[PDB]
């Protein structure tokens, strides 16, 4: 574009102000604003086709050629190798929506792009970009209040989980896993409700292990109330099933003790050598005897062990797992109700965990084995074991189920619920239009633009569903204003009715509010930029 400085002097002497000013570029003012708006519109029009049940996916290829098929706006924009700084800002915006909510990552981008596209026409008419940003802030406040007004509430109890299942089904309608729609919603709900702190209103996702294994069918995905590990029993002649398992969780390798300090044990005689030999033997025997006397029928170590320990476990009928990772050790403890023991001397019958079933699982013609721990009493940990025909659908299933879990988390944090299908956006657009009518200052135009931008989500849903955008949206808006019903939206699935409260299409109020707030704040930060400086090449 334009250069930093183009004089070189009114006297002919060199004029060097900035380093590599000749290789550097600069864009200033309205042309800079329009470049920003063009970039943002490009990103938003890329994303808008991945919106809604009839939304399509994108195939992302990384540097090393790995393929990722997804409908998740945050994953798409993260996999996208963007160079434009405004596109980077939009990627950050979507990532922020994903961090805070875990859903809406495409709505935020579409809405921000629409806001900037309307600011484009407002700037053409000559309004100051800061005035545009302030009108957008005003309209965003109005829309947030209207969302709080039209919101509904759902019960987050563990007895009737139908509202939560409906919410999760709405969230998962747009993902490839809608083939197992209700199974996935059920397992997301049961997962969060099993592991969720109702009193604190907190949900720790480290306690939800989402594991995937190629093979089987997507319908085989299930919720394990317990843990799955990628290990097998240490000895090949151990039993592959253990019922009523009393579990000893240990972070001590079944090996002779060893000081952490630099140590040298000196052997100075045949008697010293034989004493050392007998010490080693008796250490192994004493370890196994302590584990047996604790009453355990199963051992789980974190640091692996050797041939003598393995065979002694086998002889003493103590199936054992080794080389289990720290996180899985923690999850097994939490699930079985056991305490992690750092050495055998500290092991007691009360520190043991209990699992009604510990089994080794095969996966066809593979030679790889997995260990399932389940039938615990009150497991505060849980595992989601995902199956499918390829790693692409497995990864998409993982991220979609993450979206569902995050949505249930947002419900546990705030039970208020708005109805989707663009209905909430149409209602907020109506409210913003009314407030713009009551506004007599120059921000009227910015607020009308905000309404026209809010209306892009119903239009996008209709377009992706093949309906005519303008016709469908105007008819449902007219119906909303005539018969007061903010649950009137786009019949994306062609169920006949436009009532999203009847179709059980459900969004989170904090989710929608976060969408609107993030889009408005980022659009403000973009409109406030009027000069770009970048290094050459």
């Amino acid at each position, epitope marked *: 574009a334009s250069m930093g400085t183009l004089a070189f002097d009114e006297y002919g002497r060199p004029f060097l102000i900035i380093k590599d000013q000749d290789r550097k570029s600069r864009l200033m003012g309205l042309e800079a604003l329009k470049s920003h708006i063009m970039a943002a519109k490009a990103v938003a029009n890329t994303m808008r086709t991945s919106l809604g049940p009839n939304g399509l996916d994108k195939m992302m290829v990384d540097k090393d050629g790995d393929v990722t098929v997804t409908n998740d706006g945050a994953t798409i924009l993260s996999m996208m190798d963007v160079d434009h700084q405004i596109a980077k800002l939009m990627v950050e915006l979507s990532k922020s929506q994903d961090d805070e909510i875990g859903d809406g990552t495409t709505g935020v981008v579409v809405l921000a792009g629409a806001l900037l596209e309307e600011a484009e026409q407002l700037l053409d008419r000559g309004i100051h970009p800061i005035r545009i940003a302030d009108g957008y802030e005003q309209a965003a406040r109005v829309a947030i209040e209207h969302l709080d*007004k*039209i919101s*509904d*509430s759902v019960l987050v109890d563990i007895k009737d989980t139908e509202p939560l299942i409906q919410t999760a089904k709405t969230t998962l309608g747009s993902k490839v896993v809608n083939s197992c729609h209700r199974q996935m919603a059920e397992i997301a709900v049961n997962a969060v409700l099993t592991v969720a702190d109702m009193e604190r209103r907190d949900v720790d996702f480290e306690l939800i292990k989402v594991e995937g294994k190629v093979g089987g069918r997507l319908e085989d995905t299930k919720l394990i109330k317990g843990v799955i590990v990628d290990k097998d029993f240490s000895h090949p002649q151990m039993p592959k099933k253990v019922e009523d398992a009393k579990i000893a969780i240990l972070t001590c390798p079944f090996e002779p003790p060893k000081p952490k300090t630099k140590h040298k044990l000196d052997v100075t005689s045949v008697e010293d050598y034989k004493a050392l030999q007998k010490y080693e033997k008796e250490k192994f025997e004493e370890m196994i005897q302590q584990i047996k006397e604790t009453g355990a029928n199963l051992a789980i170590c974190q640091w692996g062990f050797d041939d003598e320990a393995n065979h002694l476990l086998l002889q003493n009928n103590l199936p054992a797992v080794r080389w289990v990772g720290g996180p899985e050790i923690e999850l097994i403890a939490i699930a079985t109700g056991g305490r992690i023991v750092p050495r055998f001397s500290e092991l007691t019958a009360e520190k043991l965990g209990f699992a009604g079933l510990v089994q080794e699982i095969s996966f066809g013609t593979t030679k790889d084995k997995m260990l399932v721990i389940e039938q615990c009493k009150n497991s505060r940990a849980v595992t989601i074991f995902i199956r499918g025909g390829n790693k692409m659908i497995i990864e998409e299933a993982k991220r979609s189920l993450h979206d569902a879990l995050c949505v249930i988390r947002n419900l546990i944090r705030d039970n208020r619920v708005v109805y989707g299908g663009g209905a909430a956006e149409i209602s907020c657009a109506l409210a913003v239009s009314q407030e713009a009518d009551k506004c007599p200052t120059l921000e009227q135009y910015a607020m009308r633009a905000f309404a026209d931008a809010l209306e892009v989500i119903p239009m996008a849903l209709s377009e992706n569903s093949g309906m005519n955008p303008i016709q469908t949206m105007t008819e449902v808006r007219a119906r909303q204003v005539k018969e*007061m*019903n*903010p649950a009137l939206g786009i019949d994306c699935l062609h169920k006949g009715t436009n009532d999203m409260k009847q179709q059980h299409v459900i969004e989170t109020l904090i989710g929608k509010k976060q969408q609107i707030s993030l889009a408005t704040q980022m659009v403000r930060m973009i409109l406030k930029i009027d000069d770009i400086r970048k290094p050459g090449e």
Partner: nanobody
Amino acid sequence: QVQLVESLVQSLRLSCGASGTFFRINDMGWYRQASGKQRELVASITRGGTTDYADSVKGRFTISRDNAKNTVYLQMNSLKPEDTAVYYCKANRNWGREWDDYWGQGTQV
């Protein structure tokens, strides 16, 4: 949230108007509570105008709903001493949850 305002010659007309925070008044009803008795519904009208009356008094009702201001007017004739009680108004709001019924202070006739 929903603020309700309400306004004997043996036809009496009693009004009930709603204001405040809402976006829809799902149902509007008139209730009566005689002293040492249990509240019953004089009448009630829906948004679609469909009104269902009660059994001890029916056929003489002229309950009318003004949607332009979300208010209602019940014209009752054939007055009787047993109609002498406190007349309560009921307002079903927004979605229609059990925490959405809004009562008035009641008007004694």
